[PDB]
Design a protein around this ligand. Structure first.
Ligand SMILES: OC[C@H]1O[C@@H]2O[C@H]3[C@H](O)[C@@H](O)[C@@H](O[C@H]4[C@H](O)[C@@H](O)[C@@H](O[C@H]5[C@H](O)[C@@H](O)[C@@H](O[C@H]6[C@H](O)[C@@H](O)[C@@H](O[C@H]7[C@H](O)[C@@H](O)[C@@H](O[C@H]8[C@H](O)[C@@H](O)[C@@H](O[C@H]1[C@H](O)[C@H]2O)O[C@@H]8CO)O[C@@H]7CO)O[C@@H]6CO)O[C@@H]5CO)O[C@@H]4CO)O[C@@H]3CO
Length: 383
């Protein structure tokens, strides 16, 4: 008496390819095992906050997903539990991706996607990509006409995730480096070099005339409308652009100060809620959703590159010029930090970008204020 064996999965609310693909494969798991699986759309960046509330209340999903940067935060808050999988299961995936989903020596997920932003261009507007960043920036300055919705280069310049390469080019770092990624609280986001990076961000709004209070929808919408020659964005945008009829090209970001652009690398995995009533069955589902066959289908539908060893060297991924551009850029990037203190960085740093873009605060004042705030919030991350 009482046998409603039902699992809940939260997938990104893209009202599209990512949601459908998971609905597909969860249904195949139901067909195989008899276990009912409900795939519910919840925005990628809202999932961790939602589980924080709903999880302890018994209303959270069994499987959840978000980029790995906030793993340490999630693990320290007790949102997630380490997963029980065989060595052979782990061996199917790329080591960088597995490392990103590991915290304190414990594995917290199986990867679905590995990603970096690159230069995505309209081939009908841009035949050849600029050789350097200075050339890209001049092209932007010469062609960005916000008085007609036409742009040469447009991207989320008010977002640190996107602007990181500007900071990295100047020698700036999220956390200072000294043998290992584990950084106690040495934030480097208001170093002289970090101000240099934020100086470059300012230039995109002053010289290149980028719109105020930017968001993804503005960037994507204007590109899909054929009004933008090039954007800086990730593999997650490709299907949307192609369905909008854009003949898309993808190239690594043009060299900045003569060096490879150091973009963030992101890993998206399935995680297992610490409040799941069925961790055994949910982990079985997690393995099913990240199998070679499942992830090959996921790439075809969603365009997101699966960090599965064999698939990474599969022709549809390694020998696809569009996918190749992202892969090359990611090879020059750095994984986002995943230590708990990373869960204090994003809001103040993005706020700093906004103050700079809106001409309300200087790069120095914005970043100094931001790091002060970060340090303050970290002093409450303990028992
Ligand atoms: O189609 C585009 C996109 O649109 C939808 O997302 C919108 C969302 O639904 C809105 O709610 C709003 O989001 C705000 C959010 O709700 C607020 O809480 C806050 O967000 C904070 C985060 O919660 C917090 O986690 C952190 O976020 C940082 C990440 O942790 C970090 O990993 C990185 O994020 C980047 C991702 O790593 C990367 O994958 C890439 O994301 C793309 C998606 O993968 C792709 O599917 C698609 O997403 C849809 C989405 O499904 C809709 O629901 O496009 C994405 C790129 O546009 O890019 C990420 C960076 O954007 O960096 C972030 C910090 O930027 O900190 C934040 C800030 O405190 O603020 C949110 C914004 O106001 O807006 C989004 C529209 O983007």
């Amino acid at each position: 008496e009482g046998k409603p064996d039902k699992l809940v999965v939260w997938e990104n609310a893209d009202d599209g390819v990512q949601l459908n693909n998971t609905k597909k494969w969860a249904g195949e798991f139901t067909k195989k095992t008899g276990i009912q699986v409900e795939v519910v759309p919840v925005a990628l960046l809202k999932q961790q906050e939602k589980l924080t509330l709903d999880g302890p209340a018994g209303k959270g999903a069994d499987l959840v997903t978000w980029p790995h940067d906030r793993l340490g935060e999630a693990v320290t808050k007790g949102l997630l539990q380490p997963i029980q999988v065989d060595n052979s299961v782990k061996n199917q995936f790329d080591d960088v991706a597995m490392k990103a989903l590991t915290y304190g020596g414990k594995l917290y997920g199986l990867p679905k996607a590995i990603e970096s932003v690159a230069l995505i261009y309209n081939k009908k507007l841009m035949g050849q990509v600029p050789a350097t960043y200075d050339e890209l920036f001049q092209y932007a300055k010469a062609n960005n006409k916000p008085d007609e919705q036409k742009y040469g280069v447009l991207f989320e310049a008010n977002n640190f995730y996107y602007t990181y390469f500007l900071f990295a080019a100047k020698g700036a770092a999220v956390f200072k480096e000294q043998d290992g990624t584990l950084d106690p609280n040495e934030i480097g986001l208001n170093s002289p070099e970090a101000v240099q990076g934020m100086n470059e961000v300012q230039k995109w709004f002053t010289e290149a005339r980028l719109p105020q209070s930017l968001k993804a929808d503005t960037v994507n919408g204007l590109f899909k409308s054929g009004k933008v020659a090039a954007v800086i964005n990730g593999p997650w945008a490709i299907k949307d652009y192609q369905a909008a009829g854009i003949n898309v090209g993808v190239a690594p970001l043009p060299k900045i100060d003569g060096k490879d652009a150091q973009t963030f690398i992101g890993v998206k995995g399935w995680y297992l809620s610490a409040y799941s009533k069925y961790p055994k069955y949910a982990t079985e589902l997690m393995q099913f959703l990240t199998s070679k066959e499942a992830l090959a289908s996921r790439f075809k539908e969603t365009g997101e590159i699966p960090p599965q060893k064999e698939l990474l060297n599969d022709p549809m991924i390694k020998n696809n010029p569009v996918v190749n551009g992202f892969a090359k850029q990611a090879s020059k990037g750095v994984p986002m930090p995943s230590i708990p203190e990373m869960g204090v960085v994003w809001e103040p740093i993005n706020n700093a970008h906004t103050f700079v873009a809106q001409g309300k605060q200087t790069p120095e004042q914005a970043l100094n204020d931001a790091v002060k705030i970060m340090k303050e919030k970290i002093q409450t991350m303990k028992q």
